[PDB]
Amino acid sequence: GIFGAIAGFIENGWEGMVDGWYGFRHQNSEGRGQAADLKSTQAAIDCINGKLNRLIGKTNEKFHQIEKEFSEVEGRIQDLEKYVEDTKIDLWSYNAELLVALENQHTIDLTDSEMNKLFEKTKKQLRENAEDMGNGCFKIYHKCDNACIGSIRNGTYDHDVYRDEALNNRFQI
Amino acid sequence: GIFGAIAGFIENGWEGMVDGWYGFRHQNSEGRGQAADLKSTQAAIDCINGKLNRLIGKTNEKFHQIEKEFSEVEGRIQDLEKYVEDTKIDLWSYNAELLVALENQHTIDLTDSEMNKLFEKTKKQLRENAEDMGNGCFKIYHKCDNACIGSIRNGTYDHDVYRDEALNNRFQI
Amino acid sequence: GIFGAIAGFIENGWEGMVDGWYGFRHQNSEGRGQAADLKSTQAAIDCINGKLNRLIGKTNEKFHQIEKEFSEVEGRIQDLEKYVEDTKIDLWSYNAELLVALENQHTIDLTDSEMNKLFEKTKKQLRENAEDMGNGCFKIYHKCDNACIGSIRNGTYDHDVYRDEALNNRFQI
Amino acid sequence: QKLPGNDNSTATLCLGHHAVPNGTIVKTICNDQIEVTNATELVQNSSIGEICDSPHQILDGENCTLIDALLGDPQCDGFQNKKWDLFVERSKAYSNCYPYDVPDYASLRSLVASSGTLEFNNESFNWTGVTQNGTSSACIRRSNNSFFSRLNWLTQLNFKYPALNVTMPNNEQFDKLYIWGVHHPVTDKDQIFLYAQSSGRITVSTKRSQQAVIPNIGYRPRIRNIPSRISIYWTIVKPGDILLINSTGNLIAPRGYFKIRSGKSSIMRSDAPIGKCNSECITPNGSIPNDKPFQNVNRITYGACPRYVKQSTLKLATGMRNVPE
Amino acid sequence: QVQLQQSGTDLVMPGASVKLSCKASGYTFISWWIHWVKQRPGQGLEWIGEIDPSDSYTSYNQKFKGKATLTVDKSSSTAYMQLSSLTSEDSAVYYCARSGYSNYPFDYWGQGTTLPVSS
Amino acid sequence: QVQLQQSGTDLVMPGASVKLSCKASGYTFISWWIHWVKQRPGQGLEWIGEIDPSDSYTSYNQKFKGKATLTVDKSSSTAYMQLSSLTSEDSAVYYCARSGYSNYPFDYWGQGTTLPVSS
Amino acid sequence: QVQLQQSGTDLVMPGASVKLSCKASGYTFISWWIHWVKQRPGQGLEWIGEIDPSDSYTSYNQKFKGKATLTVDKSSSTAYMQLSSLTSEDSAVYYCARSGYSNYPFDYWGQGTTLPVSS
Numbered sequence A, B, C: 001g002i003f004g005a006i007a008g009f010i011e012n013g014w015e016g017m018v019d020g021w022y023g024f025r026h027q028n029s030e031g032r033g034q035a036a037d038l039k040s041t042q043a044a045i046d047c048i049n050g051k052l053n054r055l056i057g058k059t060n061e062k063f064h065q066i067e068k069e070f071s072e073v074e075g076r077i078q079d080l081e082k083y084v085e086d087t088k089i090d091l092w093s094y095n096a097e098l099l100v101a102l103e104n105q106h107t108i109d110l111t112d113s114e115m116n117k118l119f120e121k122t123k124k125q126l127r128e129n130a131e132d133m134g135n136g137c138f139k140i141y142h143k144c145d146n147a148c149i150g151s152i153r154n155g156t157y158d159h160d161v162y163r164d165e166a167l168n169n170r171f172q173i
Numbered sequence D: 001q002k003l004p005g006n007d008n009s010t011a012t013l014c015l016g017h018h019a020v021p022n023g024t025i026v027k028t029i030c031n032d033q034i035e036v037t038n039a040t041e042l043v044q045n046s047s048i049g050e051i052c053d054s055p056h057q058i059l060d061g062e063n064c065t066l067i068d069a070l071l072g073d074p075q076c077d078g079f080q081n082k083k084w085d086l087f088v089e090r091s092k093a094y095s096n097c098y099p100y101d102v103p104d105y106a107s108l109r110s111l112v113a114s115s116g117t118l119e120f121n122n123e124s125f126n127w128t129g130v131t132q133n134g135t136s137s138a139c140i141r142r143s144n145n146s147f148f149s150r151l152n153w154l155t156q157l158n159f160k161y162p163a164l165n166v167t168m169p170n171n172e173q174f175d176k177l178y179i180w181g182v183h184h185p186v187t188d189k190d191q192i193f194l195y196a197q198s199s200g201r202i203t204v205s206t207k208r209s210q211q212a213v214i215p216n217i218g219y220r221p222r223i224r225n226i227p228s229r230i231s232i233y234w235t236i237v238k239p240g241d242i243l244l245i246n247s248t249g250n251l252i253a254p255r256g257y258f259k260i261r262s263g264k265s266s267i268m269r270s271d272a273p274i275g276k277c278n279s280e281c282i283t284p285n286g287s288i289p290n291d292k293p294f295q296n297v298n299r300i301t302y303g304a305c306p307r308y309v310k311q312s313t314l315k316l317a318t319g320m321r322n323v324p325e
Numbered sequence E, F, G: 001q002v003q004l005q006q007s008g009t010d011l012v013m014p015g016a017s018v019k020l021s022c023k024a025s026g027y028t029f030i031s032w033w034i035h036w037v038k039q040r041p042g043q044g045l046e047w048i049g050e051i052d053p054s055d056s057y058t059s060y061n062q063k064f065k066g067k068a069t070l071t072v073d074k075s076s077s078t079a080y081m082q083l084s085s086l087t088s089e090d091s092a093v094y095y096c097a098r099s100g101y102s103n104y105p106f107d108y109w110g111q112g113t114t115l116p117v118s119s
Ligand SMILES: *[C@@H]1O[C@H](CO)[C@@H](O[C@@H]2O[C@H](CO)[C@@H](O[C@@H]3O[C@H](CO[C@H]4O[C@H](CO)[C@@H](O)[C@H](O)[C@@H]4O)[C@@H](O)[C@H](O[C@H]4O[C@H](CO)[C@@H](O)[C@H](O)[C@@H]4O)[C@@H]3O)[C@H](O)[C@H]2NC(C)=O)[C@H](O)[C@H]1NC(C)=O
Pocket: D219, D220, D221, D222, D225
């Protein structure tokens, strides 16, 4: 979590987002509304399932090996076989622990990156028509923020016909 | 991938922090001052101490093993024991090198991320009342009686009366 | 930890950047032109070549080892030797795969981070002189010829002599 | 995300994430206990409890060992000419024939399990002047005194034991495993009565190896009322080599070759019952699903199996970080 | 599991006021919205209004504007819906439903409270 | 490999107009700029103009402002010069050059189209 | 090791000006602030002024406004103090103190320079 979004300026998550992983939520004149962002959610699912295809399955076939349980005491060969098996088990346990920790850290960093990417994409779409309040929300200044000129935050925000900086963006009380 | 603060935009370090790792340093009409930020310092200290907790004190008990030094010269069994020990030593040396490099890279990334997160938190707190000078400082366009400098650091800073005055100072001539 | 630059707001790479890896490109009243950025390119080249130093060239000397191919069929010792060699090969293959994946991910994150850092540096150079168009180009709202374009590419930016001309066109126009 | 009170000139658009309630704790490199929305288990904790034989030709050893089935134990006569991919030896296994002790038991068991077949071809060996098919009271087959079915106990004939000298070349295109042995009598009187000579000597040699053994006459603790032992040796004859078995006494003569090969067979020590599945991996506890990368059931595996680790659980972060409330 | 416990049957005189209840259990009451649907025996389902338990956000249907008022009790995890000036047309089965947000589908429904408005 | 195919020799009467061609192959035509150089037998190389195949950006030399017009065909990957009012001073070898952008060296050149303006 | 070497003892006539010295060694001089504390033989410690060696930023006490003048020499790593118009009340021990910043504590102190102002 290095981008500081999921535990940063977003104070808490949203229980009830049952369709997507990242989304938009608003309260304009036409009432409250929520939508999910398919692109960032799909990218996160794509990378996590790439990890899942790397890990789940792909098991090497080991048919004949050495004896790993001994019912008697022999000496040199018994000690060597036990040492080899213990070395292999310790090395693979370290590999498993390091892989799990590194991939969990990368998953959390990827989630933080996707949240910050969606936030910055919305900020660059809005330009000077909105101010970031630091809660992850965007105070949008013109009219009809996400009902009729705000379903177009799929990539088609005009941000020119609603250059309303005189209302409250640059105004004196 | 590092962020651009620790060695980039934050130019040359400060050396005056004897209590914290990250913090603020201002110049108001009441004079200059320095103060540390406990939250980012504590987060970096927590992750670094966790990385130390994975390593310091956690050792595996290996009581009986194979012989690793041979006074006499022998054939297959001695060669196999030497090969097994050399393989284990080389694998653990590679694991140690990779672990040290990965944790050092992640510590540098974490410190860079924490400095950038504190800068972005301050930028989001200041809203349109302050400007990014590129040196890492914030040209705050409203005077204060050090109460604003106190309220920015803990997190209780609002636009207050210092919004119209800040906008008038920003947009002149 | 994708910063969302190489595949984000920068839509495509520039086939034609024959020197350097990152660069600028302007559109003035004196015509079009573009040039590379030496610092970010050199930093990315330095990290990638450092990975190349730690990978290419450094090899361990293994003179005498155990037999790895067997023509006859003895049991206990040849099966421990085959098991030891198979264990070493599997561990080193896993190490190679994890190393290649981690270094490739770090290289991609680094090359995204350098582009994002250079973008943020040239964004902080022009405080209210340019706006983020979100495609990677900045709408700079003043008469800028090749002298000030190269000043922005240079680090000798003034951002004060053009501030009035870039503040009238930014708001009133 | 405290939204303002809906002023009809300016309002807000907020961003958020998933945060399913009461997710799963995973481990990272900064935090040892961080909560995420979803996580998968990467360590196979438990098996189904039984071995089962869809992809692999699992052969239940029952109360028979692999070496006993190789030698031809009367209780293991049902394993003759039987192929397998995994011989599951049971802890209830025992021997009900003449006592024996292979000097390289682990190596012989490993090579026979790697060959993975018990198919046996009889050869018309030229034993002249001796008595074949020696029987013992401790080896009972259909309520009669018998012996190992794949081993020929050769004794005296008319108080004479001519010096054996035979030859069976490997004119085939495969290796020939000859299982033989030396009988260790209990007394010099018993050795004289059995083989007409005070001391025996067996030299089973090929074109690249020789094996010379000496019987060790002496008393031993009684197993099945037998104070004698038979140490079992083996010889592998490559194509083009010649098996020369020459002896003057105490020979447990072979009956043919066992057709060792190379493949994917092994041996397991287990007590799980055999059922029906479709499972690639077999552990001594039982078959496990090989969908998880790791396991903690057993270090002994057969087939496409997860790697054994010492960890009990390893939660891979399948979802995002869970920030409730 | 998620349950929305509702009253069974309330006998209310015509022209009076009733305050229905819908106890929420098995989930966090704050983070999930609560709706109200009225179903007549001779008509289909009719959405009345919605409430946000976090800050008591109200937005009703145009038909049921002065008829219904939606309130919540975060301490007892119960959502109320007060009916005013009950007539013969108000005699129907009322359902409380948990959706997830305003424009999200109703995940779990209540048992339904039959309200016979008769003398 | 990358080539810039051109016509060999065109015989044009004086006072007429010609449309030279420079077929581009072996590379992405949009991503790389196309320039134009004229070389007289008694003079040095002279840069005429440049074209951006992405959006047809034109910037000509001051001496060749009213003489040459640069156009591209994105379908056939060809670049054209529309020479107007050819005189005796226009008899030279014309090269088309691929650079990469406006301020970059000409990576690959054409074969050279000789244009003898005579009767 | 870090230390602040000072002059031993200066015998200065009353009504004259003195320039005390505090040589800094063992640390980077420009990255640490230097303060000045006066201790009367009967009274306690009294802060006078602070200096930032990076840019010679000055901020003195209200009482010691026209008395003290703090200067630094980055070449010789010495911090001076131009005391002017010495009187009978100026005869005290003067200390120089290293600091992280203005509000950061006095990390290391000098040996102290006794200044007997007598005739
Ligand atoms: C060198 O030293 C070794 C020491 O190990 C001696 O070996 C032992 O010799 C004795 C004597 O022969 C053996 O004892 C015999 O055991 C047989 C097996 O016992 C099992 O079966 C019977 C039923 O048949 C059960 O009752 C019993 O509980 C066991 O389960 C017995 O069958 C033998 O019985 C014979 O003798 C008795 C009289 O004592 C008769 O009544 C019987 O009918 C029968 O004829 C006998 O008891 C012993 O097993 C040997 N091994 C061990 C490990 O002790 C050598 O004998 C010795 N050699 C010399 C030359 O001194």
